[PDB]
Amino acid sequence: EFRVYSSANNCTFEYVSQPFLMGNFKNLREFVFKNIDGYFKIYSKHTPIIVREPEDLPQGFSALEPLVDLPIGINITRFQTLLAL
Amino acid sequence: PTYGVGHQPYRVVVLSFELLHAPATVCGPKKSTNLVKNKCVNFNFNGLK
In terms of Cα–Cα distance, which of A24, A68, A22 is closest to A45?
A: A22
Closest-CA residue in chain A for B22?
Answer: A73
In terms of Cα–Cα distance, which of A44, A37, A46 is closest to A72?
A: A37
Whether residues A39 and B23 touch (CB distance < 8 A) is answered with yes
Question: Which residues have CB under 8 Å from B42's CB, separation 6+?
Answer: B49
B-chain residues within 8 Å CB-CB of A72? 23
Distance in Å from the first CA to the final CA of chain B: 57
The CA distance from A13 to B36, in Å, is 39
The CA distance from A33 to A36, in Å, is 10
Question: Which residues have CB under 8 Å from A80's CB, separation 6+?
Answer: none
Question: Which residues have CB under 8 Å from A46's CB, separation 6+?
Answer: A21, A22, A27, A28, A29, A30
> A70 to each of A49, A78, A83, B24, how far by Cα in Å?
29, 18, 22, 11
Distance from the Cα of B45 to chain A's closest Cα (Å) equals: 20
Whether residues A38 and B22 touch (CB distance < 8 A) is answered with yes
- Where in A1-85 does DSSP place strands (E)? 26-36, 39-49, 65-71
The CA distance from A39 to A51, in Å, is 36
The CA distance from A66 to A45, in Å, is 9
What was the elucidation method?
cryo-EM
The CA distance from A45 to B27, in Å, is 31
Which candidate in B19, B21, B25, B27 is best for mutational testing of the A interface (most A CBs within 10 A)? Answer: B25
A-chain residues within 8 Å CB-CB of B21? 38, 73
Q: What is the resolution of this structure in A?
A: 2.9
Whether residues A71 and B25 touch (CB distance < 8 A) is answered with yes
**Number of helices (H), then strands (E), in chain B:** 0, 0
The residue type of B16 is S
User: HSE (CB half, 13 Å, CA atoms) of A16?
Assistant: 0
